[model samples]
Target: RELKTVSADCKKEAIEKCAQWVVRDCRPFSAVSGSGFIDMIKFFIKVGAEYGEHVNVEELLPSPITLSRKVTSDAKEKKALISREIKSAVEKDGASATIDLWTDNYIKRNFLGVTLHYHENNELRDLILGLKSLDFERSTAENIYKKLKAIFSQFNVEDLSSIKFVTDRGANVVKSLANNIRINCSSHLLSNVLENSFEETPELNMPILACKNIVKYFKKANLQHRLRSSLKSECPTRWNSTYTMLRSILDNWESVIQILSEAGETQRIVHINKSIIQTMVNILDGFERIFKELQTCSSPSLCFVVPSILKVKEICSPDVGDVADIAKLKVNIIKNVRIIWEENLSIWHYTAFFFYPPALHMQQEKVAQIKEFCLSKMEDLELPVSPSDEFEFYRKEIVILSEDFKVMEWWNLNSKKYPKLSKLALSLLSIPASSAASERTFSLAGNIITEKRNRIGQQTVDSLLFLNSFYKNFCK
Candidate 1:
């Protein structure tokens, strides 16, 4: 439809909104100039004309150069705003810091991302400290630690290990950041758990292999268009891809077989057992579910760590399945869960659970020990007053919330009632269970730095990421 001639004031406003949309969704500024998008606009104009409304396309969009300049300018404003507020929250009360290492596949360059998670003014927030590239071969434990220290030092963090921190459990990373306070990425750990468990399961392999072979054939042969659905391929780097791949193949099982038969790929017959494949896919669905639940960086996830693994153990426990081979797979998965549960049963997880009002109750013996750690953490945060002052008051209070209760809001509401304990609660609750925030930063960077746009400046990439994050979080 025809857009009325935009007024001078509103024209700038509309163009700025367009610029924001470009930066926020990882669109290239050159997108406005693309023939593909212009064709869509002309088609819209044609539709409007057929509907008896005159339309204008030439006057609507700014040039690609104009958008690129505006995006660069807007990135600066948002970066200063983010740097301002994040500094205040992180400086006053220390943050729960999550660090992740990512590789830019196309560029073959390694990078580090540090994301700070904190709670302020009755809300949970995230801030990206840096998404800087590394000279990876020259980077070592000492050099990496030097870069990490430099990043946190900007935020005025006094002691690294004295506060909550999370990172992947990679051997190289741990050598530098191995400390009592560090929590390994739960998503990464669970991915490894599923990987190793499924690695040796020969019983499930025949059917999965059939799915892979059929999927590979469909892709390479370009025969997928003949079917009503698309097949998913699996990648080892991604944990949930196998689950998706298997589910897709099962959903289209009959269609796949018929297509292959017509193609004279009759040798593919008799490799799959539907019942056994269903069992394995069901098991993978459970692993995928909990890993996602733990990967949440938007809200309190530390408390969910304990409950999730416990739930996973029940999911992996031997139940009704005729195949004994599948049962052993679950047993092996459970064994790894036990190992993860032991490693994760620390003061961070314990105190985080207790702090969550809904998931409040635990063994009295564990609560007793948790209290000791709580007091020690108070000292670590440099807050005054001892156990008797806030401990008795905090323990005596009653809370009635389900497992889904909002803990960040609760602390915000009742924080003043108990001085030291609320501080302690927010501190632990703010800590993320996974370093998924940094993982996502790298995901966005991947989009920004593809083969066509690899030459985009790193500093601009950083600002774009910061602006996108700030708009979602702080713009309101």
Candidate 2:
């Protein structure tokens, strides 16, 4: 059985419930009666939702529901081997996979999408592998593991040797993979840090809700034009909408007072609280800087995660602000960022960043650990040439990136020198640090499965999602 949305009959029931709420309150149905009183109730509901109007109907929101292959050629190696045969390239070289789980709010059905990244033809390649659904079942890690391997079976990829999985730190996902080759999505972790660091201090919740309600009220009245700054709504898919909306509240404080007083909704209107604004600025600006660089998906490359994580740690550096609350917030944020920074990385990841010349630093720290990890892998590949011997030379060499700064271009140019290492770098770098493909796919899936359009079949949905991606990528 599937979840269903409300019908007109149920909607009437919904309205009557609101009426009952007003009548039961031991309050007036006069000025604050009808929809006015109804609106008063609606405000709390949005407040309850944290004004997260488009919470993706997330389970993450408590609302409801719900890679491959590399080819490198320096001297010799591995692809128009599309679809399953692309396995030919990844089989010979390496392939990286990204997977994410999403639930459709409209149908409340769970979907799983997989994306593949690998190096081929001197450039990186991305392909949408599958967008399958699990019906009449929970999105348990056990079944997810089953489905993941099942997809691999379809693609001739049961052996997880030459492949790595990147995903948000999802319980089902991490458990399903229980697999160390699994890479963390740094973007998702930072989002977690942004939320948890603030949430750890429960005292701040009171005024933020007060601020959120104020933003909601002004917009609902359609009287937002009266203010110099407009109220912004929070969205589920967006990273910084909450920060933007709260900052709007702070910006329009003068007008917030005027409007709420005129509307006579002063009882629970807003703070005029400078501390709330300053604290959010402290915490949220940290969010602002970190994610701005993290979501740089257009040129996403392997060397990114380490330097990016380093940058996040740098951005989260604590400031001894005057306000104790904001300072503690920064402290919590900095420490938590350090947690994910280490948690998100592994030795293999360091090699990905280390392969790039620009990211190389003078310290020479971890030089042994990086090669140590590479050496173990080489014993597996059993390549004749020593990649470490080659890597030492390239490590010190000054290489410049193209105007676009695509990582592959540098490797493609340098292939003649360190063939195995270039091949190794290309393959390792092929793995993405974020599960953005699945993230984008779910959003696209959301667009397809709207409130009025949930009748689509699973096979139909899956094919549509893949085809849409395929058409947009290489085809006209």
Candidate 3:
């Protein structure tokens, strides 16, 4: 009875309304091609026919081509809006840019993404500047540099002084931006050092590998479903994953053992001692937390890196407790960290560290270092101030501020009092410790260009990824 008649007018209006909602909310166009969508349309048609109206399936829904065009138009509008906001926000300070490369496995196409970091109204803001496909087969320094130069030209911040490059420890990227102020991603450096320490220490390797094997066994075994808890695989390159994998096993130790015993697989399921596992877990916990803290983007991480690494040195000190092997591991970690710090650390690190009033405790020698950095950059900027007077003023003034004081807010409010120093602070503090922002955009891209949607054109992928970032920022 409900389908006794069709409502053509109602059906057309409802289909357009559905398409508008789908495109407006960023839903996939293929959603309308599914059986679920057919069922929904059928239900709506039934309801419309019950009201003494006519309906036709062909006129009810827009074609996929039409839907795609609509989405593309909306995305273009969002991109323009975000670009406007980014330009407005970047007007206040020199932007620090981060770049990272990615490849779509299905298409076998290489793409690079760049993000701009800056401060606006006392808050840190990250925006996707561009994501483009590279024509070259290999990511040579020349190729990356030329591509980046083109991108910077498009954005119109090609001058090295107005922007700095923060990227991974990739040789090609570092060499590409060598003419500019290039900083390797600190988080990647820390992970590399940790990976090296793990490789060098036999004591660390055997147990970690044994645990990894067990996790792998459970993942493949038929008895895995019976287990009360699940296991995770560790990526060979990422020590953080290894840390989390071991930590997860430890947390679910009892469940693992129970499942193993129930499955009658007691041969080599639990070879590693709980005490050994506990010790390793304790050590990795510190590094894992520090890595995460450093990756934080809510506030500027540049200032935190220097202070955080210093704290890691203290936490991983050899004198923490017994177990000389563990002590050795921690020391090894510190040694590698110091080596990298010395090589990659810039005067900006000192400047950001010195500006953090709460954690501003420094020895006289360190104070001299900061003073020297200030004097050097001051000379370049042509700011005439006696080192002693400026240094004394900062020391006295910073002492008056409390630990909870917001660094950017304080600097922003007091920029008039210390114009030259504020300029330096804004520039240095805008630099992110990692290219994680650009890398995150790639992750979103992965989600966008799924197996079913693998045929998404490169330009469309870029538009979607950019709009995704922009939409989030706009909504915020």
Candidate 4:
């Protein structure tokens, strides 16, 4: 799967572009209709297949349809398609083995992809078997639904009675999967609400664009560093330059005016960097808000959150009226750090179970004993072995330790001992943390296949993304 190299900078750009595309493209469609899941997959698959190249569907969506299609009455039809494709490919020289491998292993991966593959859900396991019977094209929509039905058959209605599933309108299959999904996307809701309330007049739209434009211009490095340094040299100890700019406009009211009036010579002297440029831009945006809202607002970031503060100066504009039309934008900036750590870090640790057994962390005494055993062999070699080399030497020992822990009693024992961690660990492991990684590679893609060199086919781009993505872990 490895291919050519792309510089880190390019990869970063691609990742940003791809992520931006997701927000710009998918989020809007999702907001328009609550059930855009299938369409999302279709759009991404088509884009990846055509533009992204070499990538197969990774099944990021929920699995109701996938389950139904794999194990239903249509199973034979699906198997026939897989068999036909596999048999045909196998008939070609040295290919049958490859086809056989994908057919079986693809099914295995799908089985493992279930809700963290809880072993207690026997019906889910049976649905996995149904998937094994399916072949590529034969995994039809109906069959996928059938598999979902089989899995859901195990759950009583009461199971869902208390639990609520919250999903975006972007997921079309969600409603079909469960009855209790509370479809609420506050961001989407806010966007619509704001657009209607504020966008009707040119006066309002201009302020929004002005804010965005300020962000664009001030986000540059050169302008920021210069302005920041100038501010610091002029008034070092008392205020942070960024907050200095902010506090001047908002808190003191005339502080910025005092600075800007005497700052003609000062603006010429200061050096700027991207960060400071962005800060200045935000300061300017806040200044613009003061005019529009008829109040001295500190920052655009604070605009939605502090609507009453928006009315601090009192809106003199005819259009500006009661705050009833505007509901404050709410954001939970600080998620439980525990939840963030678990979601972002624990998943990969759990997926270690898929590739390596779990007992390595569990059996500390056994692990130490095996380490001693492995060290004795290195000692016989009469040379100091590096820690990594020692690890390689004891690979089998660790595997045995890990494998033994997979036993039911071992799980039960560890379950009680580390009950909370075990439960938290079961959340989506091995799933992509952020589309950031994929988009990162794509940025690398553009760098490798640049404006001067746009003719590169889909395959090369795929190869480049793969290489860039993998190469990033060299530092790891």
Clashing pairs in 3: 6-53, 6-54, 6-55, 7-53, 7-54, 7-55, 8-54
Query: Worst 10-residue stretch by lDDT in candidate 2?
Result: 67-76
Candidate 3 weakest lDDT stretch, 10 residues: 84-93
Candidate 2 Cα deviation (angstroms), residue 242: 2.3
Worst 10 residues of 1 by lDDT: 154-163
| Tens digits of per-residue lDDT for model 2, 1-476 | 66457699988987787578668875554634555356556666656567455544344333221101111111011012354556765576567788988888877888888887776656566767777787858989888877777656556667766677888777888888876478787778777776777677555656766777777777788878877778887654667577887787777777877778877998765444566676675557666765765544445455666666666655656666536765666677778777755666777667777777775472366777888777667657743556667766776777666667766667777775887666777677677777887777788788788776677667656656665555445553
Global lDDT of each candidate: 0.75, 0.68, 0.72, 0.30
Q: Is candidate 2 or candidate 3 better by lDDT?
A: 3
Candidates' RMSD to native? 7.2, 16.2, 7.1, 22.7
Ranking by lDDT: 1, 3, 2, 4
For residues 330-376, write the lDDT of model 3, one tens digit per residue: 88878887886546777667677777765456554567677787667
- In terms of TM-score, which candidate is stronger, 1 or 2? 1
Q: Which of the numbered candidates is closest to the native, going by highest lDDT?
A: 1
Reference-based TM-score of each model:
0.80, 0.74, 0.80, 0.25
lDDT of 4 at 28: 54
